[PDB]
Scaffold this active site. Structure first.
Site, PDB file in Angstrom:
ATOM      1  N   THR C  12       0.804  -1.241   0.000  1.00  0.00           N
ATOM      2  CA  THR C  12       0.000   0.000   0.000  1.00  0.00           C
ATOM      3  C   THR C  12       0.830   1.280   0.000  1.00  0.00           C
ATOM      4  OG1 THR C  12      -1.778  -1.167   1.137  1.00  0.00           O
ATOM      5  CG2 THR C  12      -1.889   1.220   1.180  1.00  0.00           C
ATOM      6  N   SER C  40       1.304  -7.774  -0.514  1.00  0.00           N
ATOM      7  CA  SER C  40       1.990  -8.658   0.407  1.00  0.00           C
ATOM      8  C   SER C  40       1.184  -9.804   0.964  1.00  0.00           C
ATOM      9  CB  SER C  40       2.712  -7.895   1.509  1.00  0.00           C
ATOM     10  OG  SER C  40       1.904  -7.636   2.619  1.00  0.00           O
TER      11      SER C  40
HETATM   12  N1  LIG Z   1      -2.583  -5.541   1.319  1.00  0.00           N
HETATM   13  C1  LIG Z   1      -1.564  -4.469   1.536  1.00  0.00           C
HETATM   14  C2  LIG Z   1      -1.730  -3.884   2.963  1.00  0.00           C
HETATM   15  C3  LIG Z   1      -0.872  -2.651   3.228  1.00  0.00           C
HETATM   16  O1  LIG Z   1       0.296  -2.628   2.786  1.00  0.00           O
HETATM   17  O2  LIG Z   1      -1.393  -1.684   3.905  1.00  0.00           O
HETATM   18  C4  LIG Z   1      -0.213  -5.172   1.323  1.00  0.00           C
HETATM   19  O3  LIG Z   1       0.254  -5.942   2.199  1.00  0.00           O
HETATM   20  O4  LIG Z   1       0.417  -5.073   0.253  1.00  0.00           O
END
Ligand SMILES: N[C@@H](CC(=O)O)C(=O)O
Ligand SMILES: N[C@@H](CC(=O)O)C(=O)O
Ligand SMILES: N[C@@H](CC(=O)O)C(=O)O
Ligand SMILES: N[C@@H](CC(=O)O)C(=O)O
Lengths: 321, 308, 308, 321
Positions: C12, C40
């Site tokens: 993110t 991730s």
């Molecule tokens: N789903 C995102 C969550 C974040 O980075 O805030 C990731 O892990 O890439």
């Protein structure tokens, strides 16, 4: 969209420094800084004062409460922008004296507006969301910080620099804010706002209440100085469960017998200063603060003293509000 | 089995209180001495001096020490000892949240775990320790977080050193700040400490507490500041005056976690003030009293606040 | 000014995301490489292998590394790198809770503080680090504690190493468990890792997840136990079987803090099980996969769980 | 004094080992162990089962709820002694299915009864205090541990060994217990007990709901195995805000289209798994758990499935209870 008034007082939310990196550091400007506010509210700003909240004082409190109470019918909700340092004190004062039954939401920032990843913009947005939500009414005066709605009584700042500092450290938050929506799961049971008898509409000033700290080998000079100046009340920031160093104890016992109101609180950051522990309050004429920390116990003691000087009545106030 | 000395000072937790935990005999040869008998709300400079001298003198007579102490000011005494003790054998402080006659009293197991800690050779060279609720905590960062909870003691900024399970400690941390024999504070010949008071900040704060300390010629004042160590205007005026007038001024915070930093809203250099870092006000007092045995120069005091 | 390399993996929160924080130029010469670009939640063994090899190869070309990464599995990647990286230059992981287009986005300052950390000579020899919300956290104990809070990352058992204020770090702690070049895990020639799955315990837990892993001949299974690593009866039966049958079994816990201990309700020796200590289930997986590159003996695996 | 029934199920509160030192380890005996209970209540004990709570299961849940509901009129309050491991699951099941409007209080211990400074005696005392207090009614099913009254929905165990493990990690506790008295400042707003539609009086079993964990390189085998056995529901213990590894995602998407109920929760120990984040729930037929952790989301999903298989209705249940 609801009509929401912002009453500004100052704070780091309205601060700035020469650099976006370095740590050293008007309401129209704030609003123009968060254009997204128009998606949620019709915002009007008034600058009430402009001070750092380290310099917060009784007169600012009286001015805020009277203005909220007077302007209640002209708006759908209030947001108060305020420094973080004494936010928890102002919020409790307002929680006991506001009679408006529209949301009153306090908000600040831990980083200056000029700094990288400044928390103020989104905090202000979230505070307006909260003040706009019909479900926020009748919950008392609120603090909104780091996506969280906190009640004015329990809320306190827990860390000197962390954006997530504001927590209701004994009873928890009221609701969490995600995508502009609040799921409220709690409301404070202690009596607030229109359920309290404190009426500041005609007051020009507040009873004098000082705070003294306890530690090993504590001097009695601070307490004696408040006593010599004829203070109406003294709050002890006690050790552990509200205990006092002997010298401090003796001065406060003497004071109480001359009619000084004496409340035992605690320098310990969570938990109640209880009755029936090592101090026989009824015997000395002392009042136990409960979960009220020393600065918060001062707020209630000041207001208690506008109604009564009797320790047993003051204790009952400390059990209800 | 190690030789462990218990020094009793009082508190809600010395022959009788020993005998009560006969399991101690499984882990150590315990000898008990009553140093004083007080509620720890009445803790003072004299008791502190007595303890440091006693541990420093008796260091080669035993393999470790356990100090029984009230909860209220335990975090002050631990840090005082942390800076003044020159013995590099374990010194472990312990108390109890519940009376020894109460249902589910915490004292017995706490005492056991403190002796376990004092007897562990791995506990040495970690500074003065506090052991409460199955946890070993360094004397500098440890503090009491709740008025009644048996889990009250925590190292709220940097965390514990180790957890105790089944009479064994897995230590994963040790305090970097200098302690014990890496400090220059030597208390072996002193009979009193410099006079250091604490004043509280809040809205509409009176300057009268701070004035009364300045008028008494206190050697230092610690401010329990609002937020990042800030001062109500009246208080700041009176302290600004003190700092130029023979009274060292340390800005700490009433906020329970995090550092009072330099380079925030207060020009410390201009006023001659010292920023406490993570030391809370009662902890800052301890270090300020001891700094004042060595120097009165605010620049040198700030350096001490940066290393211990 | 130090040379700092940013390795981007996604999340993110690499030329564009650099340029956006022009203040980086005040503190370092930053060079950016895109390693992969994924959420991730889709992190896998291949990405891990790529990263360890890349840092290990490129170590003498730069003065430190910053890895940009999603929040979801950051704590897994950090600990994998913590055990496999042999470079003793700082390696700092960083992400963001809020999108870069959102009001009060955390990414910019987080990136700044990560570069501050990677450039500090004091950060070296502390293992792989995660820097989030003004705090430096060791790769072993760090974990995400809230689903949306910008303050989510905490070292919930032993606390942070240091806090960052005004571009400076006061480090007061370093991880005692062995990391980086004090481990024997060497991943430089591996193209896959042993297969290790995680199963959850709860009331009326099905044995079917654990059975499906055993039937696939997984090299290890980690149990996210209830309380102190306990297992629902069905699950325990199936794992008891696995451990004697070629599948190493590590008891961890779904409970967010504290150790899964030996000498509680489970006879680990009798069943051939390993207790995870403070490693939560996803962390235990990391160490179990790496143990299984060296040994399949549950006694030797338990020793590895006791040192890293 | 009130009549209070103790329903025992086992747990470390009823455990023991060979030593008071070493860590290795009947309801009449428990009661005789806390003679002080007679100062506060007329206690009657029934042993319902005797298991470690790691072995808690649907049938024990159904047996407890039906017995409470059947015996409601014969007593003034219930205490349930239970292991700590799955206490938070049983408490939520009971919070959704009990229709008795007398307090139901759960209690356990982290140290064995035979150990030094055993927490069980005082915990049991405090649980009886709570069950005896008229102010404890209409607060839902409660957990009382370490001097603290916690609501059955938010309560969870946070540490593997600490006596202070039980916390309501999102919304905080309801009240604190000092000297046998409770100051209640909070009550859960989510609907509980007689305000829910779940009626287990005639049920012989509960819908099958399994939990799968997400992590880097997660296998889809656990999920496929639940799917192949025809599970009525699957809860995902997601990463961060309820996200799933791709392989796990694909299996659960396919399942949902064959009528399997799929709830996204989170392995992260606090905060809500929200709608409108990275997963389009409405598109896959998935439900977001909110603040319900995976084991707690299973409890609600099981009960939801006794009323409906429709994802949108299941989502509404997850927004109300
Ligand atoms: N789903 C995102 C969550 C974040 O980075 O805030 C990731 O892990 O890439
Ligand atoms: N000193 C500032 C602190 C802040 O707002 O962050 C204030 O209270 O006005
Ligand atoms: N007042 C007691 C508190 C305790 O020990 O629990 C003391 O400090 O001596
Ligand atoms: N395994 C035990 C743990 C405890 O009660 O402390 C149980 O849940 O029955």
């Amino acid at each position: 969209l609801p009509n929401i008034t912002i009453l500004a007082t100052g704070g780091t939310i309205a601060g700035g420094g020469d650099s976006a990196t370095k740590s050293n550091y008007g309401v129209e400007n704030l609003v123009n800084a968060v254009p997204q506010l128009k998606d949620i509210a019709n915002v009007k700003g008034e600058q009430v004062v402009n001070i750092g909240s380290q310099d917060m004082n009784d007169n600012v409190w009286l001015t805020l409460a009277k203005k909220i109470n007077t302007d209640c019918d002209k708006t759908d909700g209030f947001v108060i922008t305020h420094g973080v340092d004494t936010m928890e004190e102002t919020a409790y004062f307002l929680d006991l004296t506001v009679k408006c039954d529209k949301p009153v939401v306090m908000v600040g920032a831990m980083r200056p507006s000029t700094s990288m990843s400044a928390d103020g913009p989104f905090n202000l947005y979230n505070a307006v969301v909260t003040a706009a939500d019909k479900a926020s009414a009748n919950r008392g005066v609120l603090v909104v910080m780091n996506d969280t709605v906190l009640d004015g009584r329990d809320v306190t700042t827990t860390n000197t620099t962390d954006v997530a500092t504001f927590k209701s450290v004994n009873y928890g938050p009221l609701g969490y804010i995600h995508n502009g929506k609040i799921d409220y799961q709690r409301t404070p049971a202690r009596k607030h706002t229109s359920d309290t008898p404190f009426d500041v509409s005609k007051l020009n000033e507040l009873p004098k209440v000082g705070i003294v700290y306890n530690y090993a080998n504590a001097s009695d000079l601070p307490a004696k100085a408040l006593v010599d100046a004829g203070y109406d009340g003294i709050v002890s920031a006690g050790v552990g469960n509200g205990n006092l160093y002997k010298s401090v104890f003796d001065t406060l016992a003497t004071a109480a017998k001359t009619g000084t109101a004496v409340v035992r609180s605690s320098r310990v950051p969570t938990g109640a200063t209880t009755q029936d522990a090592e101090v026989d309050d009824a015997k000395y004429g002392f009042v136990a603060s409960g979960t009220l920390n020393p600065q918060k116990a001062r707020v209630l003691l000041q207001l208690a003293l506008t109604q009564t000087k009797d320790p047993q009545q003051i204790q009952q106030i400390f059990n209800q509000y």
